[PDB]
Amino acid sequence: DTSGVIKMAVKFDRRAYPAQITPKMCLLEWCRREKLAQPVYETVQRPLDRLFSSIVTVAEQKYQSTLWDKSKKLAEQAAAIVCLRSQGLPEGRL
């Protein structure tokens, strides 16, 4: 079952990665090596609180952080982390 949404409580911290290396980049490259569709991100907002989330779809499965972020870009990195971590894949961490 590739249904519903898989979630983890994660946040993107650039200090966890080498310079110019991000979870989004790592997820894109994993999809390219496995010849899967490229990841698709969809933005979720709570505009009242100035908050963002993102749901990423990879191999027909949706992934999303349980946490909310201050920007769309930061939320997308969090979604990519959930996708990588929940599958036990490397995310480019130091």
Author numbering: 348 to 441
From the paper:
The genes encoding dihydrouridine synthases (Dus) have been identified in yeast Saccharomyces cerevisiae and Escherichia coli. These enzymes are homologous to dihydroorotate dehydrogenases and dihydropyrimidine dehydrogenases and they use a flavin mononucleotide (FMN) to catalyze hydride transfer from NAD(P)H to the uridine substrate. The human enzyme conserves the ‘bona fide’ Dus domain that spans the first 330 amino acids, while a presumably unstructured linker (residues 331–367) connects the latter to an unprecedented double-stranded RNA binding domain (dsRBD) formed by residues 368 to 433. Using biochemical analysis and structural characterization, we here show that HsDus2 uses a unique strategy for binding and modifying its tRNA substrate.
Overall, the dsRBD structure contains an N-terminal extension (from Ser350 to residue 368) and the canonical αβββα topology (from Thr369 to Gly435). This extension is made of a short β strand (β1) that interacts with the βββ fold, thereby forming an extended β-sheet followed by a long unstructured linker and a short α−helical turn (η1). However, some variations are observed, notably a shorter β3 sheet and β1−β2 loop. Lys371, Lys419 and Lys420, located in conserved motifs as well as Arg397 are conserved basic residues among the dsRBDs and they are known to participate in the interaction with the dsRNA. The model also shows that the N-terminal extension does not interact with RNA suggesting its availability for protein-protein interaction.
